[PDB]
Amino acid sequence: PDEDYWQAVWPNTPIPNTLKELLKPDTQYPKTFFFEHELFPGKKMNMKFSKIPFAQPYGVEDKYCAKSLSTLIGFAVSKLGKNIQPFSSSFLDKQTDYTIEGVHNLGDKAVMCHRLNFQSTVFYCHEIHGTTAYMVPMVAADGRRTQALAVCHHDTSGMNAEVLYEMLKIKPGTETACHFLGNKAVMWVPNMAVNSVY
Amino acid sequence: PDEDYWQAVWPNTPIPNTLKELLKPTQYPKTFFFEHELFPGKKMNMKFSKIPFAQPYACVEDKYCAKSLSTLIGFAVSKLGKNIQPFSSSFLDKQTDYTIEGVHNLGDKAVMCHRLNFQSTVFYCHEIHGTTAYMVPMVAADGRRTQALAVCHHDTSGMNAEVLYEMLKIKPGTETACHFLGNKAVMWVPNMAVNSVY
């Protein structure tokens, strides 16, 4: 079972340790929001973490509820094909301040899976649309290097105007709003995007 | 000849098309910026000189002047070891306006090689210090995707304060200044840096 399911699809690759962690049977949600032009080398980010999501999980057949690694993979490949990788953020335990090292564009095709709080392995999975994903390497105040996923919504609809205002003193429709994802999210991304030039 | 010399060192790998081109028997981007201007969605309008300012922005222990692919590799490996790749900018022939689509940190260890404008393959090669190199994917006005190398200097001294001030209205020693490299430069970078978080 288990890694057999995985290795059947991606032989000579392990489950990556982040995902491996999430597949085991409260959290933190980062609350910070920002504009795209704030993703740059040397940006100082002070990260605000909450024990509870907003009323909307940020704001989130194109949706599915996976209960096993097999079903999870099935849904992902059914939308993206087989040549994909799962990524997730790795915020560090009690660190607060990070400096951005770089910003890697992962494009606008991806599937996001959010690990729900049950004992049981359960994820709510959906495609993204009108949104660009990024991988954002960072160094923390303690000197450790890690990375987080950011999501920029460019169809900047479909969200509590209140929080847009609270965080950015702006309302829908006008400009792209970005935020990070918590360590409990998995995002599946095509290999094409990741490779970039290489 | 060339591919022999190369594949001796890096077998099952071609010379990249950029480098392969520069080894056959000129414009310079005048545009300068702060590192907080490297962000997704930034617009650059690229200004190209026929000539930069006296020295880069007869090649009379950290400096070398290479005639052949063998010597070029020799020097690079001499400084960085074998696990390295060469990169170059690929500004497109008459495109002026680009949008930045991401920014990848290549670290602070590298060897920089400038193809001199002579009729035959000669490069002036040197190490860099107090400098961070970046790879910057961009999409041009006509829709083509390409990338350019950017260099940010921390040790802002040894720069014409006049030009520095002209471009950025700021004084040496204070804060870090960046610019792009022309297509005629090669930069050798460790594989670790490229791989990054992957």
Side-chain angles (χ1 to χ4, degrees), chain B residues 3 6-7 10-16:
Chain B
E3 184 167 70
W6 172 282
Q7 283 205 333
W10 301 294
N12 297 346
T13 301
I15 310 180

Side-chain angles (χ1 to χ4, degrees), chain A residues 39-41 101 103-105 147, chain B residues 39 101 103-105 134 197:
Chain A
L39 292 171
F40 61 89
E101 297 193 313
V103 185
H104 299 235
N105 197 313
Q147 62 284 326
Chain B
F39 59 91
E101 50 179 13
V103 188
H104 304 321
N105 193 308
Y134 288 97
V197 292

Side-chain angles (χ1 to χ4, degrees), chain B residues 34-91:
Chain B
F34 302 126
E35 79 190 346
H36 62 83
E37 300 185 69
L38 293 173
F39 59 91
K42 171 69 176 181
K43 300 205 199 314
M44 305 287 315
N45 305 86
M46 295 300 312
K47 311 309 193 307
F48 292 90
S49 310
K50 280 75 176 184
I51 268 312
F53 343 83
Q55 282 41 70
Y57 328 99
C59 56
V60 303
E61 191 250 15
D62 50 358
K63 295 174 169 177
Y64 183 77
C65 191
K67 175 60 171 67
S68 61
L69 178 63
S70 53
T71 56
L72 181 71
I73 292 167
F75 182 60
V77 172
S78 137
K79 298 303 198 149
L80 296 177
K82 177 180 194 278
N83 294 134
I84 61 179
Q85 283 165 88
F87 294 110
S88 295
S89 296
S90 284
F91 289 111

